[PDB]
Amino acid sequence: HVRRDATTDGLTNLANRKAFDDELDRACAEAEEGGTTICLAVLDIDHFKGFNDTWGHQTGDQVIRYVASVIGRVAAPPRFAARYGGEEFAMIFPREAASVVATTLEEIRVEVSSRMLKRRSTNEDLGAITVSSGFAERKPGESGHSVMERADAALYASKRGGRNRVTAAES
Amino acid sequence: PRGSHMVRRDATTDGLTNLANRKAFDDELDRACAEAEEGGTTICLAVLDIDHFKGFNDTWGHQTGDQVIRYVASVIGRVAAPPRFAARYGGEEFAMIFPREAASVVATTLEEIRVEVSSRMLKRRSTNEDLGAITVSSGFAERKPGESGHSVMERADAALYASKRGGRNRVTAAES
Ligand SMILES: Nc1nc2c(ncn2[C@@H]2O[C@@H]3COP(=O)(O)O[C@H]4[C@@H](O)[C@H](n5cnc6c(=O)[nH]c(N)nc65)O[C@@H]4COP(=O)(O)O[C@H]3[C@H]2O)c(=O)[nH]1
Ligand SMILES: Nc1nc2c(ncn2[C@@H]2O[C@@H]3COP(=O)(O)O[C@H]4[C@@H](O)[C@H](n5cnc6c(=O)[nH]c(N)nc65)O[C@@H]4COP(=O)(O)O[C@H]3[C@H]2O)c(=O)[nH]1
Ligand SMILES: Nc1nc2c(ncn2[C@@H]2O[C@@H]3COP(=O)(O)O[C@H]4[C@@H](O)[C@H](n5cnc6c(=O)[nH]c(N)nc65)O[C@@H]4COP(=O)(O)O[C@H]3[C@H]2O)c(=O)[nH]1
Ligand SMILES: Nc1nc2c(ncn2[C@@H]2O[C@@H]3COP(=O)(O)O[C@H]4[C@@H](O)[C@H](n5cnc6c(=O)[nH]c(N)nc65)O[C@@H]4COP(=O)(O)O[C@H]3[C@H]2O)c(=O)[nH]1
Ligand SMILES: Nc1nc2c(ncn2[C@@H]2O[C@@H]3COP(=O)(O)O[C@H]4[C@@H](O)[C@H](n5cnc6c(=O)[nH]c(N)nc65)O[C@@H]4COP(=O)(O)O[C@H]3[C@H]2O)c(=O)[nH]1
Known part of the structure; x- marks a missing residue:
């Protein structure tokens, strides 16, 4: 001298945070022009740093791949899934x-x-x-x-409820 | 929702860089040490740390952090042809x-x-x-x-701390 896809995540091959942020704006502007709905979810691996302390960073990587796999198998288009942060x-x-x-x-x-x-x-x-x-x-x-902030606030509610749960912002 | 057929990947390797992982390195270290005892041969162990690494992820995001891990790992891998052995040892080591x-x-x-x-x-x-x-x-x-x-790893790590306390971006031999 071939470059890897700059819009994907290396560990999981989902979209990365910046690709998700560009896709989110586009999807919102399109639901606003066509008067259609759109829902945003945010997920976090519970006790993730704990896994890395107990078992090592390599095993933490495999827990990310495990969860990313589950999410990906259920995010077929027009759904869109991304690795949004280290554990999110x-x-x-x-x-x-x-x-x-x-x-x-x-x-x-x-x-x-x-x-x-x-x-x-x-x-x-x-x-x-x-x-x-x-x-x-x-x-x-x-x-x-803004809708990303309401979803994050629901994720925090789920964490405070005791984790291992789903929370709608509208509750 | 069952996905298509795949094979487990090499579990002795690292995902981000495909150098060896900590556990493979640890076994390889014990093996190489035993060979150097019974052979009367020498063997050395270095440990390296990416300086200011959390700061990177804080300033530029996790994705950019991964690019720096891959860049530094590629530099290390070029000079680690066997019998040398390189590994991603921890998140940034x-x-x-x-x-x-x-x-x-x-x-x-x-x-x-x-x-x-x-x-x-x-x-x-x-x-x-x-x-x-x-x-x-x-x-x-x-x-x-x-x-x-x-105990070799312990001495090499103590040299690594010596480098960090020395101001980083430097190399310290444990024999000091
Ligand atoms: N999409 C794509 N574009 C490519 C590729 N190779 C070169 N380019 C484009 O060509 C410019 C100059 O590449 P260069 O002369 O190797 O000059 C490069 C090279 O000397 C060095 N460099 C950058 N990335 C890498 C890398 O991943 N590995 C290595 N070994 N060197 C790199 O930095 C210089 C500046 O890179 P840029 O500012 O990005 O600017 C790059 C980039 O815009 C490619 O494989 N895919
Ligand atoms: N001459 C030249 N060669 C290029 C260029 N882009 C890619 N390559 C070649 O293609 C390999 C793959 O790059 P990558 O997938 O971006 O994967 C890269 C990338 O993830 C990260 N990396 C390396 N340099 C840079 C950089 O300048 N900027 C960023 N963001 N990441 C880098 O490290 C990985 C390994 O890099 P390498 O071992 O160099 O391996 C690079 C390099 O050999 C280029 O612009 N110029
Ligand atoms: N880009 C990137 N950065 C890394 C990685 N590993 C560590 N870091 C950076 O180093 C900081 C300290 O991580 P730690 O002490 O291992 O503690 C980390 C580690 O236990 C775990 N973690 C975060 N990201 C990853 C990851 O990609 N893989 C694994 N296995 N664990 C991670 O969560 C803790 C909190 O992480 P942060 O608050 O994000 O802050 C992390 C993050 O900024 C990595 O593989 N990629
Ligand atoms: N039925 C079955 N299938 C197998 C087995 N080993 C590998 N596979 C298949 O091979 C894919 C790649 O496995 P991987 O590279 O270990 O990549 C894995 C691994 O990094 C992590 N992971 C999943 N399950 C486990 C586990 O039980 N232990 C550990 N340490 N990691 C796991 O999640 C990644 C994705 O896993 P999958 O989506 O399930 O995707 C898996 C799965 O489709 C097996 O023993 N039984
Ligand atoms: N190298 C390699 N070996 C393979 C592969 N597939 C199966 N094996 C071997 O076959 C044993 C039983 O596989 P299983 O019936 O899927 O039974 C597996 C499977 O139900 C589950 N499992 C383990 N890893 C994964 C995974 O990555 N994905 C999924 N979906 N399931 C897994 O845990 C059970 C116990 O797994 P183990 O104790 O590892 O024991 C595994 C492993 O020794 C493969 O793709 N590559």
Whole structure:
């Protein structure tokens, strides 16, 4: 001298935060022109730093890949999923009712916690992996950043409720 | 919702860089140490740290942080052809084994890595902004005749702390 895709995340091959932010603005402007709905969810891996302290950074990477996999299998277009931060994922649900989004997030959290992952090196049990979740419907005049803040506030509510749960901003 | 068929990847490697991972390195260190005892041969161990690394992620985001991990890892991998052995050792640490090489060669090599990492200024793929200079700090130890892998690593890490306290962007031999 070939460059990797600058809009994807290396560990998971989902979109990265900046691609999600560009997609969010576009999706909001398009739901605003066509009078259609859009829902935003934010997910966080529970006790994630704990995994890295207990088991090592390599195993933390595999917990990210595990959860990213579950999310990706349920984010077929027109849905959009991204690795949003070190332990956070974000999803766009266009033209879907808020109760459908809640059912999808509840299905993600059941799936993630539904088997005991094992350490590849030693076969020790890692402990169950749970996930906390917050979603919000876009309001009529509302920008992507604003509805993202209402979804994050719901994620915080889920964390304060005791984690391993889904919370609608509209509650 | 069952996905298409895939194979487990090499679990001795690191995802971001495909150098070895901490657990593979630890076993390889014990093996190489035993071979150096029964062979009467020498062996050296360096440990490297990306300076100011959380600051990067705070200033530019996690994605950009990953690019710096891959850049520094590529510099290390160029000089780690077998019998040498490199690994992503922790989130921002690398480690290298130099079997049958003198401390003088390791010192010179780490000095080469240090200069190479800092030699150009990376730009973000997404916005073309200048990240600034990236440096690494570095410690290494020569294995003593009776010494286990763990105690060599302990001495090499203490050299690495010496470099960080020295002001970073430098190389310290444990024999000080
Ligand atoms: N999409 C794409 N574009 C490419 C590729 N290769 C070169 N370019 C474009 O050509 C410009 C000059 O590349 P260069 O002469 O190698 O000059 C490069 C090269 O000397 C160095 N550099 C940048 N990225 C890398 C890298 O990933 N690996 C290495 N080894 N050097 C790099 O930085 C200089 C400036 O890079 P840029 O400012 O990005 O500017 C780059 C970039 O805009 C490619 O594989 N894919
Ligand atoms: N001459 C030249 N070669 C290029 C250029 N872009 C890509 N390449 C080649 O393609 C490889 C893949 O780059 P990548 O996928 O961006 O993966 C890169 C990238 O993720 C990160 N990285 C390296 N340099 C830069 C940089 O200047 N800026 C950013 N943001 N990341 C970098 O480190 C990874 C490994 O880099 P390499 O070992 O250099 O390996 C690079 C390099 O050999 C270019 O503009 N000029
Ligand atoms: N770009 C990137 N940066 C990294 C990575 N590992 C560590 N860092 C950076 O180093 C800081 C300290 O991480 P830590 O002490 O390992 O403690 C970390 C570590 O336990 C874990 N963590 C964060 N990101 C990752 C990741 O990508 N992989 C893994 N396995 N763990 C991560 O969560 C803790 C909190 O992380 P932060 O608040 O984000 O702050 C992290 C982050 O800024 C990495 O693989 N990629
Ligand atoms: N039925 C079955 N399928 C297997 C097995 N090993 C590998 N696979 C398949 O190979 C894919 C890649 O596995 P990976 O590279 O370990 O990549 C994995 C790994 O990094 C992490 N992961 C998933 N399950 C575990 C686990 O039980 N332990 C650990 N340490 N990591 C896991 O999540 C990533 C994605 O996992 P998947 O989406 O399930 O995607 C997996 C799965 O489709 C197996 O023993 N049984
Ligand atoms: N190298 C390699 N080995 C493979 C692969 N697929 C299966 N094996 C081996 O076959 C054993 C049983 O696989 P299983 O019936 O899927 O039974 C697996 C599977 O139900 C689950 N599991 C483990 N890793 C994964 C994963 O990455 N993805 C999924 N979906 N399930 C996994 O845990 C059970 C126990 O797994 P282990 O104790 O690891 O034991 C695994 C592993 O030793 C592969 O793609 N690559």
